[model samples]
Target: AGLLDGKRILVSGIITDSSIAFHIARVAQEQGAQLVLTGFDRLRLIQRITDRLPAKAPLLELDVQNEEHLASLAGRVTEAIGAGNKLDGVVHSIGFMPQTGMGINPFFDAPYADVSKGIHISAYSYASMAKALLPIMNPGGSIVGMDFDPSRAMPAYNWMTVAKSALESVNRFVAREAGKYGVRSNLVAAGPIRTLAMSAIVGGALGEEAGAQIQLLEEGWDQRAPIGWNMKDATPVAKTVCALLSDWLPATTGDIIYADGGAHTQLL
Candidate 1:
C-alpha cells in the first residue's frame, strides 16, 4: 500500500492538467488515496480536465461564496467518497482577483468592496473549507492549501499578495481551531511555475512589471534554488504534500511547508 492508502481526500481547483492541483490529485491517486473532486459551474470544462485523472473520481459542486453549497459539502462528500469513509484530507486550490486587485486600476485599491471577494476566496475560504470538512474529517485529518510566500511582494502579484499573506495567517488559525480535533492544517508555499495561475499573472494582467518580476525570479531561481529547481516539475511539491498528509506528519500542524526549492532560504 502507498502512503495515502485508506485515505479519502477532497481535491478542488483542477481546471486544467497544468494546474498544481492536478499534480496533487495525480500523486494522491498514485499513492493509493481515493478522491472526491469539487468543482464550480463549469461542468463541461472541468469534466474535460477531470477525464485526464488516472481514475474516475466523483465530482461534487462547491462554490465557496454560496452558503447553501457550503452547507451541503459534507453530505456531498459522503455521497461521493462512500458511506463509512470520511474525509481524511482536503486541498484548497481556488483563488481569483479582479483586474483592480491586480494593480491595473489602482495600486492601492480599497480592501472591502473592490478586493474583498478575492481575499475571501483565496484566504477566508481556507477557514470556511476547514470548518466544512472538519465534521467529516477523521482524526489526524489534514488540510492543505496552495500559497505563494509573501515575505516580500512580487510584480503584478498586488492584491494577490494581500490574499496570500492572509491565507498564511488563516492556515495557522485553522490549525488552532481544528487542532483539538486531531486535525492538521498547513499550506504549501510552492516555487514559481508558469502554470495556470502563473500564466495568467504573466499575461497582460499585471502589466509589464509582471515580466520584469518573473525575469528576476527565473534568473535568481536557477542560482538560489539549492536543489536545482525544475520550472516544469511539480512532483517535488506534490511529494511534500503527500508526506504532510500521511501518518508521517502526525506531530506536525499549523505549518507552512516550503516547496520552493530552497528559494525561501536563499540570502539572495
Candidate 2:
C-alpha cells in the first residue's frame, strides 16, 4: 500500500505550479492521500494550478492571518474531505513579508506593522492552524511547515529570518502541547528553492542585485551539502513531508528535519 493510504491532508501556499505545496499535493495524492487545498484571494488562479494536480482537490479559502478563516477551518475541512474522514495532516506552507521587510531594508528599518504581519503569517499561523484543526485531527495526526535554518539569518531575508525563528519556536510549543492528544508537529527546513516565492525575492523590490544573492544560495548549498543541492527540484522536500505525515516517524515531533541535501551539516 502507499505510505499515505487512506489519509486526508489539507495543504496551503500553492500559488503556482512551481510552488512547494504544489509538489507536496501531487505526491500526497500519488501516495494515496486525499487532499483539500487552500488559497487566499487568488481563487481563479489557485483553481488553475489545482487542476494540474494528479487528482481533483477541493479548494478552500484560508487566509492564515484571518481569525475568521482560522476559526472556520475545522468545519470547512470536514466539509471538503467528507464526514468521517477528517484531516490526518495539515501542511502549513504559507509565508509573507512586506516589500520593505526583506532585502530592501535593514531589519530595524522594516516597519513594525509589516514585520508583525510576517510573524503572524509565517510564525503564529503555525499555532493557529494547529488550534483550528485539532478538533477533527486523528490522535496520531501531524502538522508540517516549511522553514529554513532558524539559527542563521540571511541579509536579504531580513525579518523573514526572524519570523522563521519564531516559526521554529512555535512548532516546538505546538509539539509539546499537542502531544497529550498523540498528535505531532514538525518542520522541513528546505534548501534554496526557486519557487514563485523565490521569484518575489530575486525579481522583487529587492532589485536585480538580489539575483546574484540567489546564485550564492545555489553555490553555498552545492559546496556545503555533501549530497549536493538542487534549486529546481522540490520533489525531495515533498517526499520528506509525506514521510512526516506517515507512521514512519511515529515518535518524531518538534524537530526541524533538514531536506537541504545535507547542507545544514557543513560548517567548514
Candidate 3:
C-alpha cells in the first residue's frame, strides 16, 4: 500500500510547476492521498497547474494573512473534498518577503513593517493554520511546513531567514499545543531547489549578486551532503513530507527533520 493511502491532505503555496508545493502535491497523490490545493492571488495560474496532478484535486482561495480565509478554511476544505471527511495532513508551503526586506537592503536597514509581514506569513501562519484546521483534523493528523536551515544566517536571505527561525519556534509550540489532541506538527528543512522563490532571491527581488552567493552555497551543499544533494529535484523533500504525513513517525512531533541529504550534519 502507498504511504498516505486514503489520507486527505490540504496543501498551499503552489504558484508554478517547479514549486515545491506542487511536487509535494504530486508525491502525495502518487502515494495514494487525496488532496485539496490552495492559492492566494493566482487562481487561474494555480488551476492550470492543478490539472497536472496525477489525480484531480479541487483548488481553493487561501491567503494565509487573511483572517476570513483562515476562518473558513476548515469548512471550505471539507466542502471541497466532500462532506464528512476530516483532513489527515496539511502542508504549509507559504512564505514571502518584501523587496526591501531581503537582499536589496542591508540587514539592519530592513523596515519593521516588511519584517513583520514576513514573520506573519512565514512564521505565525503556521500556528494560525493549525488552529483553523484543528476542529476538522484527524486525531493522528500531521501538519508539515517547509523550512530552510534556520540554525544560522544564510547569505542574502535576510528577513526570510529570520522568518524561518520563527517558524521553527512556532512548530515546537504548535506541536506542544496540538499534541494534546493527538495531532503532530513538524517541519522539513529542505536543501536548496531551483524554484520560482529561489529565482526571485537570485535575480528578481534580491539582485544578481545574490545569485552568485546562492551558487556557491549550492555547490558547497553538493560537496558536503554525505548522501549527495540535488538542487534541481524536489522529490527527496516531498517524500520526507509524505513520511511525516504517514503513520511511521507516530512519536515524532514539534521537530525540524532535515531532508537536505545530510548537508546540515557535515558542517565544514
- lDDT by residue for model 2 (1-268), tens: 8899988888999988998999999999999998889998899999987998999988999888788998888888887788887778989988988877887566688889988988988899899889888878898899999998868766577788899999999899999988887899999999988887686666654776665676677688889988888888899999999999999898899998999999888884
Off-target runs (Cα >4 Å) in candidate 3 are 203-205
TM-scores, in order shown?
Answer: 0.94, 0.96, 0.97
Scanning candidate 2 in windows of ten residues, the lowest lDDT window is 203-212
Which candidate tops TM-score?
3
The candidate, 1 or 3, that scores higher on lDDT is 3
lDDT of 1 by residue, 66-88 (tens): 99999888988887777888888
lDDT of 3 by residue, 237-260 (tens): 999999999999999999989999
The top-ranked prediction according to lDDT is 3
TM-score of 2: 0.96
What does the lDDT read for residue 32 in candidate 3?
A: 96
How well does model 1 score by local distance difference test? 0.84
Higher-ranked by lDDT: 1 or 2: 2
Off by over 4 Å in 1: 103-106, 203-205
What CA root-mean-square deviation does each model show from the true structure? 1.6, 1.3, 1.2
For candidate 3, give the lDDT of residue 250.
95
